[PDB]
Scaffold this active site. Structure first.
Site, PDB file in Angstrom:
ATOM      1  N   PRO A   1     -25.155 -48.916   7.321  1.00 28.28           N
ATOM      2  CA  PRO A   1     -25.249 -50.075   6.415  1.00 28.28           C
ATOM      3  C   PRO A   1     -25.146 -51.361   7.208  1.00 28.28           C
ATOM      4  O   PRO A   1     -24.640 -51.335   8.333  1.00 28.28           O
ATOM      5  CB  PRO A   1     -24.005 -49.980   5.524  1.00 28.28           C
ATOM      6  CG  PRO A   1     -23.817 -48.467   5.399  1.00 28.28           C
ATOM      7  CD  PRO A   1     -24.215 -47.893   6.788  1.00 28.28           C
ATOM      8  N   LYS A  32     -19.435 -44.379   4.684  1.00 25.20           N
ATOM      9  CA  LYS A  32     -20.147 -44.143   5.942  1.00 25.20           C
ATOM     10  C   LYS A  32     -19.204 -44.342   7.148  1.00 25.20           C
ATOM     11  O   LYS A  32     -18.273 -45.157   7.092  1.00 25.20           O
ATOM     12  CB  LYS A  32     -21.325 -45.113   6.006  1.00 25.20           C
ATOM     13  CG  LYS A  32     -22.252 -45.092   4.777  1.00 25.20           C
ATOM     14  CD  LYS A  32     -23.584 -44.490   5.044  1.00 25.20           C
ATOM     15  CE  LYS A  32     -24.514 -44.632   3.839  1.00 25.20           C
ATOM     16  NZ  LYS A  32     -25.794 -43.998   4.081  1.00 25.20           N
ATOM     17  N   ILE A  64     -28.770 -46.987   3.226  1.00 27.45           N
ATOM     18  CA  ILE A  64     -29.549 -45.809   2.808  1.00 27.45           C
ATOM     19  C   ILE A  64     -28.758 -45.002   1.771  1.00 27.45           C
ATOM     20  O   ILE A  64     -27.786 -44.297   2.131  1.00 27.45           O
ATOM     21  CB  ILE A  64     -29.941 -44.946   3.997  1.00 27.45           C
ATOM     22  CG1 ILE A  64     -30.861 -45.728   4.923  1.00 27.45           C
ATOM     23  CG2 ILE A  64     -30.741 -43.747   3.501  1.00 27.45           C
ATOM     24  CD1 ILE A  64     -30.982 -45.115   6.304  1.00 27.45           C
ATOM     25  N   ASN A  97     -27.196 -59.758  -2.399  1.00 25.65           N
ATOM     26  CA  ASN A  97     -28.311 -58.906  -2.715  1.00 25.65           C
ATOM     27  C   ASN A  97     -28.072 -57.499  -2.125  1.00 25.65           C
ATOM     28  O   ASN A  97     -27.795 -57.378  -0.943  1.00 25.65           O
ATOM     29  CB  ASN A  97     -29.590 -59.473  -2.195  1.00 25.65           C
ATOM     30  CG  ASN A  97     -30.081 -60.645  -3.007  1.00 25.65           C
ATOM     31  OD1 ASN A  97     -29.656 -60.861  -4.101  1.00 25.65           O
ATOM     32  ND2 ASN A  97     -30.930 -61.407  -2.448  1.00 25.65           N
TER      33      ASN A  97
END
EC number: 5.3.2.1
Lengths: 114, 114, 114
Positions: A1, A32, A64, A97
């Site tokens: 990320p 993660k 992801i 975002n």
């Protein structure tokens, strides 16, 4: 990320250890490993939010998977809280975002994650 | 909405009042209230457009809705016009990426817009 | 196509010619004429990758088409190679996000590409 923060707060106001704190909290939040977490902080920007140049931030979180309705509410509480506590930015002057990336669309180490 | 402009035009060439002008024209164009419009201008960048380092810009407009074929044509005329008038950037050396964001993927004020 | 690289490598470490090399190689890789390739390098950033501040990069490649699984693997080999050779960034400290843009969502020259 990958988490990016662009802000008009000055560089001197970004505390030592902020990138390390973000790395840890993001690893915890996303589930993660921290080895895959990238963080990028961009202070001293020319920015306005609602016409005003009071402290504000524009951010992005790309991952992801681990992106969705409930997850993104949770991330926003976390990250707005950190920006408020560490950079003194009001949560109502922050946009984040969220992007759920396909593995085939993320390059790393001479190939993609697909 | 959030509008970001990255340019190789130097800071001293960005006129006073430019962020306010952007905020206003974007509120009119998008129909969104100005209190929700965020603007970010990044001058002095190391950039090239078509191999050339003549004035150029790479921009983004993110919005929850109000993104589409006709609307984006209209935005591009407005925004290229402003970059030309105020920064002296030729419209043919500007790219503007438009993103229609899902409300669930935009964080603000400790939660999301969903 | 538009390629953006954000890095903690200092400005003095970006070699002469690098924006041109990127422009040329991206034109070849994407098959798009170099006149349409834009490149943007942002050095000296406050970044961490995997919890550390050795050389790293966060990048994006936006293109109208010419994005997909095999294509993106090929782009990553090329671009990680260039960042390794020219900026001394390990390919395992690079993320590149690939965006297949719809022509109606890309502004240029007062209109869109649609």
């Amino acid at each position: 990320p990958a988490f990016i923060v662009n802000t008009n707060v000055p560089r001197a106001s970004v505390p030592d250890g902020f990138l390390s704190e973000l790395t840890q909290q993001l690893a915890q939040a996303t589930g993660k490993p921290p080895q895959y977490i990238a963080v990028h902080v961009v202070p001293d920007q020319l920015m306005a939010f609602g016409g005003s140049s009071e402290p504000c931030a524009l951010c992005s979180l790309h991952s992801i998977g681990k992106i969705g309705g409930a997850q993104n509410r949770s991330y926003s509480k976390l990250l707005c809280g950190l920006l408020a506590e560490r950079l003194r930015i009001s949560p109502d002057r922050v946009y984040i975002n969220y992007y759920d990336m396909n593995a085939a669309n993320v390059g790393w180490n001479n190939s993609t994650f697909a």
